[PDB]
Amino acid sequence: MRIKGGKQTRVRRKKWLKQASGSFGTRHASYKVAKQTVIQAAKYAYRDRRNKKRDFRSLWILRLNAALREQGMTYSVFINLLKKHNIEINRKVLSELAIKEPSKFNLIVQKVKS
Amino acid sequence: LNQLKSVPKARNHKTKTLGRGHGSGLGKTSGRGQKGQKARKSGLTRPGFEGGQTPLYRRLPKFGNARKGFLKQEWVVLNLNKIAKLKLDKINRASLIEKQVISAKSQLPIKLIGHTKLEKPLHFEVHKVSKQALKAVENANGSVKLLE
Amino acid sequence: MKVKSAAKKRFKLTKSGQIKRKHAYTSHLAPHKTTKQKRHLRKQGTVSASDFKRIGNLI
Amino acid sequence: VVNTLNTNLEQSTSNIKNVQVKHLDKVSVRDLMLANALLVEKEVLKALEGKF
RNA sequence: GUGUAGUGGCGAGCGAAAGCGGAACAGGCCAAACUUAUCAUUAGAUAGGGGUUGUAGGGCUUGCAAUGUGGACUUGAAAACGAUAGAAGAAGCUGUUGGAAAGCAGCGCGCAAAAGGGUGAUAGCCCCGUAUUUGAAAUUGUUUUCAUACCUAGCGAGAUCCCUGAGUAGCUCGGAAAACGUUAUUUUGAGUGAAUCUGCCCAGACCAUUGGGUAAGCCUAAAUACUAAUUAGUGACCGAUAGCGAAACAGUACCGUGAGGGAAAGGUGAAAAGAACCCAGAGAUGGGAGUGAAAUAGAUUCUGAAACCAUAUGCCUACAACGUGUCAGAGCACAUUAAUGUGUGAUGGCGUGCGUUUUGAAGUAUGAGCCGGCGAGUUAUGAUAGCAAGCGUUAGUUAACCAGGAGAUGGGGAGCUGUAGCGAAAGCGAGUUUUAAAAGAGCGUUUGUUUGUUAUUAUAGACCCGAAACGGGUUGAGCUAGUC
RNA sequence: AGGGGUGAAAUUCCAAUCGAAAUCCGUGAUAGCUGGUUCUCGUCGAAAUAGCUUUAAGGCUAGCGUGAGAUCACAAAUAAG
RNA sequence: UUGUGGUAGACGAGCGUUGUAUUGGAGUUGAAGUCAAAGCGUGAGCAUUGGUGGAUCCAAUACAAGUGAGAAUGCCGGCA
RNA sequence: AAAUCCAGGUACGGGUGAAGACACCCGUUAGGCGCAACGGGACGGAAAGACCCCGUGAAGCUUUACUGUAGCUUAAUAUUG
């Protein structure tokens, strides 16, 4: 039984090409290049799925410090007044967007002083 | 069975392939080398060769051929530890052929061998017997009529 | 396959493996070796487990 | 499956994809279970017992 | 038998002969003595009878009894079975989607014929057919019967009667087929060169004994190998980059002065029904109309995707250091295989390809222009090891071969491993070799068999592709070198 | 007429090719030397050392991974003496 | 509870294509291929739907493989 | 019309890196796209480096290297008295 084997190649190439959509140049038409592009794209996605959970935390800290420098005290001092005294495991993104609800974060700000 | 539910139990094992897939588990150079000599076509040089060092089958001395150009005289052996299981008496060439012990047409002397005890009396007709085998046969009221 | 006759004259089979062989150093220059040496090497011998595979399929 | 090899039976059954006539020695293990329905001769029982 | 005996710089390797079991099976014919006739009867030559040799035979002198067994075989008469042309040869309508029914639904019909092909879709009953029964003017083949021509036959007795294959065989000098690399065996290029049944040769140097056979003459059917041809059939063989290089006016077109090397491409539509005629244009052609179910089936003619190149909706870009993607992200225009939805991505963070070879890759080493198709672990015979299966305490097991549907299987036990091993061997034996040793040491102290399958390995090119090469056979002096 | 021809000799020429033509066959010559060796997934997981080698870019044996089985404690490692 | 980086490499478990053996099914009310679509798995992959098309395919179990393409300064065919 | 071509929207200084960067790090400069020139770089294009070295490679040539051998020469022998 001589085997022709045509469907597999077409379906594999179409599936690989469909993944890389909205790509510059011919990189969305050539399967041989499309596979490399999607390889690199998924590697970047893998590294960014941790890079973003780190960068969001960085912006988290930055926007907390932005609000806390206005009260005349240090961000590290605020974390301290959370941890050792008036034990609080309060969420950082919580207290961040409690800037959006006005003055409600100020309750936590004034509560750390026993 | 039916012709729609034939089933095995433990056959149909894995089929290794030396030229399918970069990461199938077996690579492009599966089995043979990583550009070494064995990896190349017609590798795995003759089994007796040992790299250039003198072969083992030559470093050793040569055995003897005391009887030059002859075959050892073959015999048909009747061990006394197994004849007792075979249910037949007066064991003689006129009666071996019936029990399919020996080939129907074959000319060959019969050798009698054994030390294990025997209970039922037997009457051997052979060409030669071991001394203690003969003693054991005659201990149990047996008789051996030693032929020529 | 054909078994190399050059080796069938230098090995002897025994029950349950244990290929038998003769030691070398027996046909030359006796005085260079002690009489005790020839006394040891007169006996037979067997190969180790190292070269068993290269001898098995070859014989 | 027939032991006598009757001509009257074998004259018919030759234009149907479902029926065919064979001797006892001729049928194999495969065909014997491909039938889904068996019609055996009364004679073949003794020979089958003899051959086990 | 057997990878046995053996042969090998005892290396790669090489590999019998008996015997056994099968296929088929059958032995005959000349010279020689003896004799007849003829040859300038000197013939040594020509032509007739006689015998075909080992349980030695034949010729000679002399008896008995055949009238037949038979085919490597001459012709005549017939017969059967084929072969080369043909014939007969069963069975249906109705509705349905439908361009068309044969498919689909309801009730029927025949098969010694339900192989196959065609018919506006997959038809047993529409057509050719097919199983079976038949048919040969003429030619031809095989076999059968009878008659006929040539060749052929058993058992005795005597007898130191005669004959029984000449440059023959051995021997020497060099080789060669033999499994042997030269050793009896065989064969011969150079020489040497006997006997006559009281013989000669043979049984791996040779002699003797023993046993076996009659060379130096000739002939032979079947059983074995192959298929370019004809007939019929088959295919877990291929389907236009496949299949023989040749599905088409292929060894053609072409490349060569010649040996030779050697291409590519098939498919409208059921039926040409191949587009009357009109408009534009000179025309090709296109748009129409018309046939057609379909003209997006239109002569470029089945299906029509990729690199490619154009046009278009929505969005974005002209302060931008850019492997161009990824994670968040406003705005914009739409609404889906309803899915925390889709396209686009102004902006921020991060961000030096894919393979191969490598101490080491983004490389200033390499491999790819893209796209589509092809493009390498198999097969035969054996070994090893796992797994699984059947059989099992005298186990197990078939090969070739015969039987059939080109089937498993039936018969076919020839052999194979296991049952005892040890020893170089003679031989011995649960022991055996070493030895004075029964002391010790090595080995042994019954522990399967046949397959399926898997992995490795052995000989075959044995994963794929890649050389300068070697040898043998052909074609070239029209270019050129020389000569005439 | 090609392990040959010719050669006022240069390794010139012998059909643009000549340290020995073109072509066909043995021929699928061999190649320890390049490059390639196409389906995925689950578990474990090195070496670039020693010896030998007409061997040094190779191969063989040992160690190093892995599959099956045994030893489970008298065997192996960790801390202490 | 102990773990799950990974080439050379051992080893286990699976998919896909072609054909065949049966058992069921779809098909001029429209198969395959192919175009595109905002589906479902751990993967080779497997669905659904509309247009193109007018004759073959699909499901479950087995068996046999000219069998799964990214490269070989590839080769054919077309095209920047 | 061609060689080439991994996909490209392709900057510079200092440094870094398989050791001389269009992309890497830090700074600097720069509207998108043509056209005519001019060749510095992209270790540029074209030759699987001719050189060296390796291969248990090829070919040719050489001699008091090996084994042979055509031819030449001597001897026994048949042709042979």
Give the contacts of B75 (CB within 8 A, at least 6 positions apart).
B108, B109, B110, B111
| Strand boundaries in chain A, DSSP class E | none
Convert B36-75 to b/e letters by CB count within 10 Å (16 or more is b).
eeeeeeeeeeeeeeeeeeebbbeebeeeeeeeeeeeeeee
Report helix, strand or coil for D52.
Answer: coil
Cβ-contact B118, B134 below 8 angstroms? no
Domain residue extents for chain A: 1-114
Report helix, strand or coil for B123.
Answer: strand
Say which nucleotide is closest to residue C53, CA to C1' distance: E384
Q: Can you read off the two tokens belonging to residue C16?
A: 């349950």
Cβ-contact B116, B80 below 8 angstroms? yes
Calculate the alpha carbon distances from A73 to A26, A65, A68, B140, D45 in Å: 56, 9, 6, 117, 107
Nearest-CA neighbor of A57 among A65, A46, A69, A47?
A65
Domain residue extents for chain C: 1-59
Residue B4 sits at the chain D interface (C-beta within 8 Å): no
Please state whether strand F lies within 7 Å of residue B27 at its CB atom: yes
Amino acid identity for residue B88 in this structure = L
Rounded CA separation B134/B111 (Å)? 12
Give the contacts of D39 (CB within 8 A, at least 6 positions apart).
D1
Amino acid identity for residue C51 in this structure = D
Nearest-CA neighbor of B117 among B70, B81, B90, B67?
B81
Nearest-CA neighbor of C21 among C57, C59, A84, C36?
C59
Nearest-CA neighbor of B116 among B91, B141, B93, B140?
B140
Report helix, strand or coil for A91.
Answer: coil
CB-facing half-sphere around the CA of B65: CA atoms within 13 A? 8
- DSSP of chain C: ----HHHHTS-EEETTEEEEEE-SS-SS-GGGS-HHHHHHHTSEEE--STTHHHHHTT-
Rounded CA separation B121/B123 (Å)? 7
Cβ-contact C19, B56 below 8 angstroms? no
Measured between beta carbons, which residues in chain C are less than 8 angstroms from residue B62?
9-10
Report helix, strand or coil for A111.
Answer: helix
Q: Can you read off the two tokens belonging to residue A81?
A: 């007044």
Neighbouring C-beta atoms of residue B110, cutoff 10 Å: 20
SS3 labels along B56-99: HHHHCCCCCCCCCCCCCCCCEEEEHHHHCCCCCCCCCHHHHCCC
Q: Can you read off the two tokens belonging to residue A99?
A: 């800037």
> CA-to-C1' distance for A76 and F27, Å?
85
- Give the closest residue to G46 (Cα–C1′): A11
Distance from CA of B4 to the nearest CA of D (A): 11
Cβ-contact A20, A41 below 8 angstroms? yes
Nearest to C21 among B47, B48, B60 (CB): B60
Cβ-contact C56, C28 below 8 angstroms? no
Q: Footprint of strand H, using CB within 7 A?
A: A 24-27, 30, 33
Which residues lie across from B112 on neighbouring strands?
Answer: B78, B129
